[PDB]
Design an enzyme around this catalytic site. Structure first.
Site, PDB file in Angstrom:
ATOM      1  CG  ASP A 131       4.586  -1.125  -3.700  1.00  0.00           C
ATOM      2  OD1 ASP A 131       4.948  -2.396  -3.149  1.00  0.00           O
ATOM      3  OD2 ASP A 131       4.877  -0.008  -3.217  1.00  0.00           O
ATOM      4  NE  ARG A 155       3.617  -1.983   1.022  1.00  0.00           N
ATOM      5  CZ  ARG A 155       4.308  -3.234   0.845  1.00  0.00           C
ATOM      6  NH1 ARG A 155       4.485  -4.559   1.639  1.00  0.00           N
ATOM      7  NH2 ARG A 155       5.134  -3.449  -0.242  1.00  0.00           N
ATOM      8  CG  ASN A 156       0.531  -0.996  -2.516  1.00  0.00           C
ATOM      9  OD1 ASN A 156       0.324   0.196  -1.721  1.00  0.00           O
ATOM     10  ND2 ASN A 156       1.885  -1.309  -2.512  1.00  0.00           N
ATOM     11  CG  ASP A 197       1.134   4.288  -9.363  1.00  0.00           C
ATOM     12  OD1 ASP A 197       1.833   3.923  -8.279  1.00  0.00           O
ATOM     13  OD2 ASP A 197       1.604   4.667 -10.440  1.00  0.00           O
TER      14      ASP A 197
END
Ligand SMILES: COc1ccc(Nc2ncc3c(n2)n([C@H]2CC[C@H](O)CC2)c(=O)n3C)c(C)c1
Length: 304
Positions: free
Chosen positions: A166, A170-171, A184
């Site tokens: 991912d 945004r992560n 994570d």
């Protein structure tokens, strides 16, 4: 899936699958030594809350931390997924560009996973707020630092045969000194209410960040994380624009990416940085660079 996973490789060798083994009780921290504050975010079955931890670690520090835990909706499968994330983080070890594991509370109440708190929030919001400021403005050196810091975190995961699944602005979180960290966040991030996660049967997938072999064949490798990293570079060097601007996720979108369509050079990317994105976006996964090769080239752009 949108969670980290240890895979087999025949460079780096996978002797053990930490998720399939018991938890190391060396991480145990007393839950009554945590004072909870505000909720940072929440997913369908988990949430992350800020807390002050009293007497944490070797230095017996009093510090702001992030605590992951289950929501009321969680059952056995979700409890396993949290324990599995805890087991992965205990196995990987520490890295300066990862949201590190600091402790856990697995007895005397609900499971709590204590990790580093990132005081400046997510990179995406940071870039957007800086870009729209009316008035210290971002410089190319800042963007190169973010890119390098994420690449180093990703080269660390790749060295441990760990896939992220991912990679996106945004992560990426920003901590003291605006240093970038990956983690994570699949169990605690708001997927259900974020339109960037597209409904595909029973799954919700970040289609605009995914490699063609991941969307179509459900193949996830270090090379598919490289593709997503190229999308992330585009987000960094456009100062947080949504990928494939104004193009809706539909059949024409899949056809375009399958056919080799690539986003245009972003406004703040030097040509050499755009060349990294193009290389990440090779249709053939083996023609994409490794994260170590990206780190090396980014170091050349920072120096020169
Ligand atoms: C929007 O405002 C934000 C966002 C993040 C942080 N810092 C932050 N530090 C550590 C985190 C963390 N967040 N989260 C999530 C929170 C939801 C977000 O959507 C993904 C990351 C974690 O799972 N750990 C371990 C802050 C202080 C404000």
């Amino acid at each position: 899936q949108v969670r980290w996973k240890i895979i087999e490789s025949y460079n780096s060798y996978t002797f053990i699958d930490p998720t399939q083994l018991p938890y190391n009780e060396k991480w145990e921290f007393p839950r009554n030594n945590l004072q909870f504050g505000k909720t940072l975010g929440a997913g369908a079955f988990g949430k992350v809350v800020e807390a002050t931890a009293f007497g944490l670690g070797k230095e017996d520090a009093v510090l702001k931390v992030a605590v992951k835990m289950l929501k009321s909706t969680a059952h056995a499968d979700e409890k396993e997924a949290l324990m599995s994330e805890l087991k992965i983080m205990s196995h990987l070890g520490q890295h300066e560009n990862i949201v590190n594991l600091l402790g856990a509370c697995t007895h005397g109440g609900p499971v709590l996973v204590i990790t580093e708190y990132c005081c400046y929030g997510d990179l995406l919001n940071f870039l957007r707020r800086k870009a729209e400021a009316m008035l210290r403005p971002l410089e190319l050196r800042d963007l190169l630092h973010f890119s390098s810091q994420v690449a180093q975190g990703m080269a660390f995961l790749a060295s441990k045969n760990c896939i992220h699944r991912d990679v996106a602005a945004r992560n990426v979180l920003l901590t003291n000194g605006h240093v970038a960290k990956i983690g994570d966040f699949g169990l605690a991030r708001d997927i259900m209410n974020d339109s960037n996660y597209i409904v595909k049967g029973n799954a919700r997938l970040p289609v605009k960040w995914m490699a063609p072999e991941s969307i179509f064949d459900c193949v996830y490798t270090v090379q598919s994380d490289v593709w997503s990293y190229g999308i992330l570079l585009w987000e960094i060097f456009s100062l947080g624009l949504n990928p494939y601007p104004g193009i809706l996720v539909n059949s024409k979108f899949y056809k375009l990416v399958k056919d080799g369509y690539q986003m245009a050079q972003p406004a703040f990317a030097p040509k050499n940085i755009y060349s990294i994105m193009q290389a990440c976006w090779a249709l053939e996964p083996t023609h994409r660079p490794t994260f170590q090769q990206i780190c090396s080239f980014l170091q050349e752009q920072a120096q020169e």
